[PDB]
Amino acid sequence: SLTADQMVSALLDAEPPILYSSMMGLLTNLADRELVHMINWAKRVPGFVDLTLHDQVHLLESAWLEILMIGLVWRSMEHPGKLLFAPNLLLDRNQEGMVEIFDMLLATSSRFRMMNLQGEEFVCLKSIILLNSGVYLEEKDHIHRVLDKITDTLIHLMAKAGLTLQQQHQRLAQLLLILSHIRHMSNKGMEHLVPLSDLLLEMLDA
Amino acid sequence: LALSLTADQMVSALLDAEPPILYSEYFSEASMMGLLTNLADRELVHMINWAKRVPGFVDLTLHDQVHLLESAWLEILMIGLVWRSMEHPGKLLFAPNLLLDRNQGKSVEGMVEIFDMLLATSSRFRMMNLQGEEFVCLKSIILLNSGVYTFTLKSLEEKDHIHRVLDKITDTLIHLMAKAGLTLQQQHQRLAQLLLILSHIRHMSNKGMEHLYSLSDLLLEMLDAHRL
Numbered sequence A: 001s002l003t004a005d006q007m008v009s010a011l012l013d014a015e016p017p018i019l020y021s022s023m024m025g026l027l028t029n030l031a032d033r034e035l036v037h038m039i040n041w042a043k044r045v046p047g048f049v050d051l052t053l054h055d056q057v058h059l060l061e062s063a064w065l066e067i068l069m070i071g072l073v074w075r076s077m078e079h080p081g082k083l084l085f086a087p088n089l090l091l092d093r094n095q096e097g098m099v100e101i102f103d104m105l106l107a108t109s110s111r112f113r114m115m116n117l118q119g120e121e122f123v124c125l126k127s128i129i130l131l132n133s134g135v136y137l138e139e140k141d142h143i144h145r146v147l148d149k150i151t152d153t154l155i156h157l158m159a160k161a162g163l164t165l166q167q168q169h170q171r172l173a174q175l176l177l178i179l180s181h182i183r184h185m186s187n188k189g190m191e192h193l194v195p196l197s198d199l200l201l202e203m204l205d206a
Numbered sequence B: 001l002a003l004s005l006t007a008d009q010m011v012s013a014l015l016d017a018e019p020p021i022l023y024s025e026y027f028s029e030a031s032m033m034g035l036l037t038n039l040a041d042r043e044l045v046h047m048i049n050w051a052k053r054v055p056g057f058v059d060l061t062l063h064d065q066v067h068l069l070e071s072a073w074l075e076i077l078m079i080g081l082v083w084r085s086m087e088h089p090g091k092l093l094f095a096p097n098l099l100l101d102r103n104q105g106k107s108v109e110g111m112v113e114i115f116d117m118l119l120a121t122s123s124r125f126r127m128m129n130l131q132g133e134e135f136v137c138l139k140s141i142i143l144l145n146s147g148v149y150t151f152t153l154k155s156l157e158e159k160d161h162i163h164r165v166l167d168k169i170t171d172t173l174i175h176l177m178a179k180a181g182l183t184l185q186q187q188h189q190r191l192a193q194l195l196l197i198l199s200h201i202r203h204m205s206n207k208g209m210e211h212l213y214s215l216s217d218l219l220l221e222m223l224d225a226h227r228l
């Protein structure tokens, strides 16, 4: 029922912290710690907790890598040619099979700068990834009504910046089309790298 | 020219550029994959002729036309297949004479997973009553979008052109929806629903590439036509 402004506010307040840091051992350990904070960020995505724990775990399981990636890209925009994994972990391109995904993450940062992605826009993109990455009946309806509620919020945000309706649906399309690339990097990321379901449930206890 | 097209003129060109539906040869579990590979192989030739007719596409360099098609060709086959199958619940219409069900897919190692994912996309389009004009817009977006992030001054010019053309197709999708009577919220919501499905088609494409591995040269040579 929330308004677009209240939607934004709740998402902005739910942002997880930036965490701090043998390269792959460091990156795995950092990703494990971020995942915990992702779970509690997910709880605060409005509409998410209305789902069953089984649906909650299905979405998180299908989207966690995409979420770590778009968050990496978001904090790496002001660091051209480099990924800011952690504030004490800034790697560039020279830092088997890694450089292709690293090249893809950089081009994602480059695209975010080209579009001048806004923070408000970013937290809507993350929520869309959470609810959409796994949607493929009452549950789906709800997921799609909330995805619809987030669409309404992205348009409001753009209208508030003074964009014409033409520029609004154009920018919305451009933002949602980046999600395919992020899905693509996640797929390629999964290849390059007890069930995660059971760990995801356990994290949902705190 | 492509950027001066109206929405209707964009729909019209996309519809006219549509490739024909092909058939399989005039069956068993053992020959299934040879038939599907023959089909894809012939469809690809026609896919090239279709892409050359998507407004703005031939304004690109050859090398960039190849890149876009290497990146999108499987997604385009799949979205074509899903569209053909929309009106056959539980079934994929690879060709009018090659309609397969989940069980026939179970026959191959790893196939049913892709097959269940393709079948759900088809039911999702069905639930949305996807129109033909929106379909040809979605397939064009896949063509121009799928590789635009895996590419010089010249390359910057190229990507800017692609995103301008992708904007015109977005104006065209919205024009269709307003033409279909939709309110301005529903227009934005349906546009988003359609473009999020493309994420799932990408997902299917990559899982599909792993199954097919479990072409650059060819594309240039269908694209790099002489003028004789």
Ligand SMILES: CCCN1CC[C@@H](COc2ccc([C@@H]3c4ccc(O)cc4CC4(CC4)N3C(=O)c3ccccc3)cc2)C1
Pocket (backbone or CB within 6 Å): A027, A028, A030, A031, A032, A034, A065, A068, A069, A071, A072, A085, A097, A098, A099, A101, A102, A105, A189, A192, A193
């Ligand atoms: C048993 C518990 C299971 N966990 C869950 C899966 C299992 C390892 O998952 C992991 C392991 C490492 C990562 C990092 C990481 C960390 C933090 C970040 O913000 C972002 C990223 C980005 C990422 C995803 C591409 N990555 C890389 O290194 C990288 C590789 C190639 C090119 C560029 C970057 C992410 C997830 C351990």
Ligand SMILES: CCCN1CC[C@@H](COc2ccc([C@@H]3c4ccc(O)cc4CC4(CC4)N3C(=O)c3ccccc3)cc2)C1
Pocket (backbone or CB within 6 Å): B036, B037, B039, B040, B041, B043, B074, B077, B078, B080, B081, B094, B105, B110, B111, B112, B114, B115, B118, B208, B211, B212, B215, B218
């Ligand atoms: C030099 C070129 C080399 N060729 C070009 C690539 C190389 C074969 O690639 C191929 C081979 C087969 C296909 C079919 C096919 C055919 C027609 C169609 O319209 C759509 C599809 C969809 C598709 C992609 C999922 N598929 C399957 O069977 C299938 C698998 C798992 C579950 C369900 C279906 C598509 C591409 C040989």
